[PDB]
Design a protein around this ligand. Structure first.
Ligand SMILES: CC[C@@](O)(C(=O)O)c1cc2n(c(=O)c1CO)Cc1cc3ccccc3nc1-2
Length: 578
């Protein structure tokens, strides 16, 4: 009995929370109360099986039981569409159909933040409904969120209302906490979409390679075999979560945290404080721990991987473990290299051996592999450096605007709402990284860029429209950032000017939040480039100044909002001609 085994390992509160997540991530459109109802029926039944494993349907697989239960409300096609397809199939085809239909961008309303009082009240009314509502609204909007990590967010979200709703100043206590959750959640959501993309589109080998490089940078004192044990466990964990085996995911990860804390001494010296925290916090901690110091001396790599006379023999015995050791050994020594660079390096090294081990004295042919890594290291280095300089002398917003133009030009076919979100997010790399030293700037920057570009890829695949986007997204996971950086302006692009209402601001632009106000400013910049590309650089900055003041004043006009036409039509003319 599986549901019995998992129910007792995870305990009831989390079991219930994880089932609700699983339903909310598969049927993102079902209303909240329907999902709660289903989760409760499933929870009644689990207990039945805990009480008797030889009962009833207690011997079924989780996806059969859970899939059957979901389909009691999904099969209604007239309201869910293409999801009744999945309900016509049996496991495991049914689960695969659910995985294919996760929506990275469902047509759901913006999450709104009520007044602090309104929220504390709704919290006090029914604390448990308030929390499940949180789990539900986040999950359906982030169908790939790392499920056990979402439990931790709920925990903190609860603690924020519990504490701040009885502070003297409720707002001053509550708001900065939520803002912090909103921001960390967004980063965590994106980071985990990359994890699942790599698993699902590029396969297990890709995720393992990522894992060896990151855990080795993180745990450079650890023996190689230790890291492999860790890589293997971690790989099963994310394979389970991305495959929608959420109960197994949580359980296996909780065991993983345990194994780590009971063997810190063979892993890292940074884990002491983390391994004292409670269950959820402990696992949040370990997964993001700062890198350990690397051993003081360390050889030279060239000896075991270039000058040895057994390198072809080690490669031929087991490519995987030998290339793994290379990645292990090169990564431990380089916390200053991005994870992607480190993987380009291992691919270059792998490719070189496959060539040189042919014949004609291989030992002579592989002699300069490390001279090939040089330009691969230089390229990202100059990009980040050259970019931080540009950022520091422009400030996030103008930096964001510049990326917005350069990228609209790279791939103008791409929908505007997508260009805006990705650009703003790409631009965020300035604040996040440029503060850093050189020996910390690359992993901070490139891996973050890789996460943002994966968002581009997945928001685009749902409905493809740019060959170039599809090519970079499909061709090689590790090379995405280079493949996008190398794109120049699309010369084939045909502009679609005129206008109509896609430049006529309305009066409700005054009641929206300031960032949300830039979003319709930056939106309109995209339609400006998309239809008048090659408009240099400086009358772009002149049409942007012109949009700002026009909104500043027509919100001050106190008029019958006919100014939103007045200086609305006085820009349309200077914009085109001169
Ligand atoms: C329910 C929380 C809250 O309503 C809040 O007041 O902070 C809220 C929460 C969130 N967002 C929001 O726009 C708002 C509204 O600003 C976006 C967003 C992305 C997230 C991604 C991952 C995890 C939690 C997230 N929470 C929020």
């Amino acid at each position: 009995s599986e549901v019995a085994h998992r129910f007792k390992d995870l305990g009831e509160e989390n079991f219930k929370a994880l089932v609700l997540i699983a339903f909310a991530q598969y049927l993102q459109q079902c209303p909240f109360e329907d999902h709660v109802k289903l989760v409760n029926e499933v929870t009644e039944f689990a207990k039945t099986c805990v009480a008797d494993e030889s009962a009833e349907n207690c011997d079924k697989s989780l996806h059969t039981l859970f899939g059957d239960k979901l389909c009691t409300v999904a099969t209604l096609r007239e309201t869910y569409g293409e999801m009744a397809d999945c309900c016509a199939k049996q496991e495991p085809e049914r689960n695969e159909c659910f995985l294919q239909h996760k929506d990275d961008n469902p047509n759901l309303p913006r999450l709104v933040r009520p007044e602090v009082d309104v929220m504390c009240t709704a919290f006090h009314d029914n604390e448990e409904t308030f929390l499940k509502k949180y789990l539900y609204e986040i999950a359906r909007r982030h169908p790939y969120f790392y499920a056990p990590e979402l439990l931790f967010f709920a925990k903190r979200y609860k603690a924020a209302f519990t504490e701040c709703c009885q502070a003297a100043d409720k707002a001053a206590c509550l708001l900065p906490k939520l803002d912090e959750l909103r921001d960390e959640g967004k980063a965590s959501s994106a980071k985990q979409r990359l994890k699942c993309a790599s698993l699902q589109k590029f396969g297990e080998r890709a995720f393992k390679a990522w894992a060896v490089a990151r855990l080795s940078q993180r745990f450079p004192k650890a023996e190689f075999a230790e890291v492999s044990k860790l890589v293997t466990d971690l790989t099963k964990v994310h394979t389970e979560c991305c495959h929608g085996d959420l109960l197994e995911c949580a359980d296996d990860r909780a065991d993983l945290a345990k194994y780590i804390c009971e063997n810190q001494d063979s892993i890292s010296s940074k884990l002491k404080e983390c391994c004292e925290k409670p269950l959820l916090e402990k696992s949040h901690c370990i997964a993001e721990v700062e890198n350990d110091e690397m051993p003081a001396d360390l050889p030279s790599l060239a000896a075991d991987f270039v000058e040895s006379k057994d390198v072809c023999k080690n490669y031929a015995e087991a490519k995987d473990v030998f290339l793994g050791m290379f990645l292990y050994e090169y990564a431990r020594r380089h916390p200053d290299y991005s994870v992607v660079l480190l993987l380009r390096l291992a691919k270059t090294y792998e490719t070189t051996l496959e060539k040189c081990c042919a014949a004609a004295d291989p030992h002579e042919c592989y002699a300069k592999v490390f001279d090939e890594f040089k330009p691969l290291v230089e390229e990202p280095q100059n990009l980040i450096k050259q970019n931080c300089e540009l950022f520091e002398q422009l400030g996030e917003y103008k930096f964001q605007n510049a990326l917005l133009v350069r990228y609209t030009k790279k791939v103008p076919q791409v929908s505007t709402p997508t260009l805006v979100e990705v650009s703003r997010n790409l631009g965020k790399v300035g604040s996040k990284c440029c503060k850093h030293p050189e020996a910390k700037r690359m992993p901070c920057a490139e891996d973050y860029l890789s996460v943002v570009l994966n968002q581009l890829c997945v928001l685009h695949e749902k409905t493809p429209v740019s060959d170039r986007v599809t090519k970079c997204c499909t061709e090689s996971l590790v090379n995405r950032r280079p493949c996008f950086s190398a794109l120049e302006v699309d010369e084939t692009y045909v502009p679609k000017e005129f206008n109509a209402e896609t430049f006529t601001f309305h009066a409700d632009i005054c009641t929206l939040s300031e960032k949300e106000r830039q979003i319709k400013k930056q939106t309109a910049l995209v339609e400006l480039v998309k239809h008048k590309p090659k408009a240099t650089k400086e009358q772009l900055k002149a049409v942007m100044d012109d949009f700002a003041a026009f909104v500043e004043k027509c919100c001050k006009a106190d008029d019958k909002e006919t100014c939103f036409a007045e200086e609305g039509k006085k820009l349309v003319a200077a914009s085109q001609a001169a």
